[PDB]
A = this chain, B = another copy of it.
Amino acid sequence: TLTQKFHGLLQHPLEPLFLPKNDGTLFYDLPERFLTSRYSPIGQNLANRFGPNSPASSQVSNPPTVVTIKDLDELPDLTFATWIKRRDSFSLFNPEHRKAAGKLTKLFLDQPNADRLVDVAAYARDRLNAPLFQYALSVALLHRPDTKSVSVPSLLHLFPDQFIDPAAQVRMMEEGSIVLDENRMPIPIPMNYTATDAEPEQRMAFFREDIGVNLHHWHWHLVYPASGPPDVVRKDRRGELFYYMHQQLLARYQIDRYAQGLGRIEPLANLREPVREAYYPKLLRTSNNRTFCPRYPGMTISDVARSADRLEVRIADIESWLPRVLEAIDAGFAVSDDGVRVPLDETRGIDVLGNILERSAISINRNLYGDVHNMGHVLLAFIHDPRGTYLESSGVMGGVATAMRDPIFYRWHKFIDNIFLRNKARLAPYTMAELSNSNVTLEALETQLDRAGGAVNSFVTFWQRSQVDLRAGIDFSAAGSAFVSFTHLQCAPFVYRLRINSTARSNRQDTVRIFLLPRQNEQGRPLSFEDRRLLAIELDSFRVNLRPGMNNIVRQSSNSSVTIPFERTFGNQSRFCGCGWPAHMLLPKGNANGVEFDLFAMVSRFEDDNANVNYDENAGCDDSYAFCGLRDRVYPSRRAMGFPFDRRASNGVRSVADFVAPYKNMRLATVTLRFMNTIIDR
Q: What residues make up the interface of A, taking CB atoms closer than 8 Å to B? A: 14, 16, 19, 39, 42, 45-46, 49, 87, 165-167, 169-171, 173-174, 177-180, 183, 192-196, 198-199, 278, 280, 282, 284, 286-291, 293-294, 296, 299, 384-385, 387-392, 475-476, 478
Tell me, rounded to whole Å, the shortest Cβ–Cβ distance linking A88 to chain B. 10
For A42, list chain B residues within 8 Å (CB). Answer: 179-180, 183
Tell me, rounded to whole Å, the shortest Cβ–Cβ distance linking A39 to chain B. 7
Tell me, rounded to whole Å, the shortest Cβ–Cβ distance linking A45 to chain B. 7
With A280-B385, A392-B280 as contacts: A45 and B167 at CB distance below 8 Å: no
> Which among B39, B194, B288, B391 is the interface contact of A195 at CB below 8 angstroms?
B391
> With A and B bound together, what is the CA distance between A385 and B14 in angstroms?
34
Tell me, rounded to whole Å, the shortest Cβ–Cβ distance linking A315 to chain B. 17
For A178, list chain B residues within 8 Å (CB). Answer: 16, 19, 39, 46
Decide if B174 touches A278 in the complex (CB within 8 Å): no
> Which among B16, B183, B287, B387 is the interface contact of A170 at CB below 8 angstroms?
B287
Which chain B residue shows the least CB distance to A182? B45
Tell me, rounded to whole Å, the shortest Cβ–Cβ distance linking A100 to chain B. 21
Extra contacts, 11 of them, besides A165-B289, A174-B475 (Cβ < 8 A), are A19-B178, A42-B183, A46-B178, A167-B289, A173-B475, A174-B476, A177-B476, A278-B390, A280-B392, A282-B392, A294-B384
Which chain B residue shows the least CB distance to A290? B167
Decide if B289 touches A166 in the complex (CB within 8 Å): yes
> With A and B bound together, what is the CA distance between A294 and B14 in angstroms?
27
> With A and B bound together, what is the CA distance between A245 and B478 in angstroms?
46
With A42-B179, A183-B42, A476-B177 as contacts: A289 and B296 at CB distance below 8 Å: no
Decide if A173 touches B390 in the complex (CB within 8 Å): no
Closest 9 CB pairs of A and B: A166-B289, A177-B476, A280-B390, A198-B389, A167-B288, A173-B476, A170-B289, A167-B289, A195-B390
- What is the oligomeric copy number? 2
For A289, list chain B residues within 8 Å (CB). Answer: 165-167, 169-170, 282, 284
With A42-B179, A290-B167 as contacts: A194 and B389 at CB distance below 8 Å: no
For A291, list chain B residues within 8 Å (CB). Answer: 284, 291
For A290, list chain B residues within 8 Å (CB). Answer: 167, 282
Tell me, rounded to whole Å, the shortest Cβ–Cβ distance linking A484 to chain B. 14
A-B contact pairs, 11 of them (CB 8 A): A46-B178, A87-B171, A166-B289, A173-B475, A177-B476, A192-B391, A195-B390, A196-B390, A280-B385, A282-B289, A284-B289
Decide if B183 touches A390 in the complex (CB within 8 Å): no
Decide if A194 touches B390 in the complex (CB within 8 Å): yes
Which chain B residue shows the least CB distance to A49? B180
Q: Quick one: which of A14, A49, A198, A476 has the most chain B CB within 10 A?
A: A476
For A387, list chain B residues within 8 Å (CB). Answer: 198
For A389, list chain B residues within 8 Å (CB). Answer: 195-196, 198-199
> With A and B bound together, what is the CA distance between A16 and B195 in angstroms?
31
> Which among B180, B294, B476 is the interface contact of A390 at CB below 8 angstroms?
B294
> With A and B bound together, what is the CA distance between A475 and B409 in angstroms?
37
Decide if A180 touches B45 in the complex (CB within 8 Å): yes
For A166, list chain B residues within 8 Å (CB). Answer: 289
Decide if A288 touches B170 in the complex (CB within 8 Å): yes
> With A and B bound together, what is the CA distance between A121 and B87 in angstroms?
40
Which chain B residue shows the least CB distance to A180? B45
> With A and B bound together, what is the CA distance between A173 and B173 in angstroms?
13
> With A and B bound together, what is the CA distance between A183 and B14 in angstroms?
20
Tell me, rounded to whole Å, the shortest Cβ–Cβ distance linking A20 to chain B. 12
Tell me, rounded to whole Å, the shortest Cβ–Cβ distance linking A24 to chain B. 14
> Which among B167, B171, B192, B293 is the interface contact of A294 at CB below 8 angstroms?
B293
For A199, list chain B residues within 8 Å (CB). Answer: 389-390
For A46, list chain B residues within 8 Å (CB). Answer: 178
> Which among B169, B280, B296, B385 is the interface contact of A299 at CB below 8 angstroms?
B296
For A19, list chain B residues within 8 Å (CB). Answer: 178
Which chain B residue shows the least CB distance to A19? B178
Q: Quick one: which of A87, A166, A290, A296 has the most chain B CB within 10 A?
A: A296
Tell me, rounded to whole Å, the shortest Cβ–Cβ distance linking A28 to chain B. 15
Tell me, rounded to whole Å, the shortest Cβ–Cβ distance linking A395 to chain B. 12
> With A and B bound together, what is the CA distance between A167 and B285 in angstroms?
10
For A391, list chain B residues within 8 Å (CB). Answer: 192-196, 280, 282
Which chain B residue shows the least CB distance to A168? B289
For A171, list chain B residues within 8 Å (CB). Answer: 87
Decide if B286 touches A170 in the complex (CB within 8 Å): yes
Tell me, rounded to whole Å, the shortest Cβ–Cβ distance linking A40 to chain B. 12
> With A and B bound together, what is the CA distance between A229 and B92 in angstroms?
56
> With A and B bound together, what is the CA distance between A424 and B45 in angstroms?
67
Which chain B residue shows the least CB distance to A202? B389
> With A and B bound together, what is the CA distance between A200 and B194 in angstroms?
33
> With A and B bound together, what is the CA distance between A195 and B387 in angstroms?
11
Which chain B residue shows the least CB distance to A171? B87
For A278, list chain B residues within 8 Å (CB). Answer: 390
Which chain B residue shows the least CB distance to A185? B38
Q: Quick one: which of A177, A278, A385, A390 has the most chain B CB within 10 A?
A: A390
Tell me, rounded to whole Å, the shortest Cβ–Cβ distance linking A36 to chain B. 11
> With A and B bound together, what is the CA distance between A39 and B177 in angstroms?
12
Which chain B residue shows the least CB distance to A278? B390
Decide if B299 touches A388 in the complex (CB within 8 Å): no
> With A and B bound together, what is the CA distance between A39 and B183 in angstroms?
10
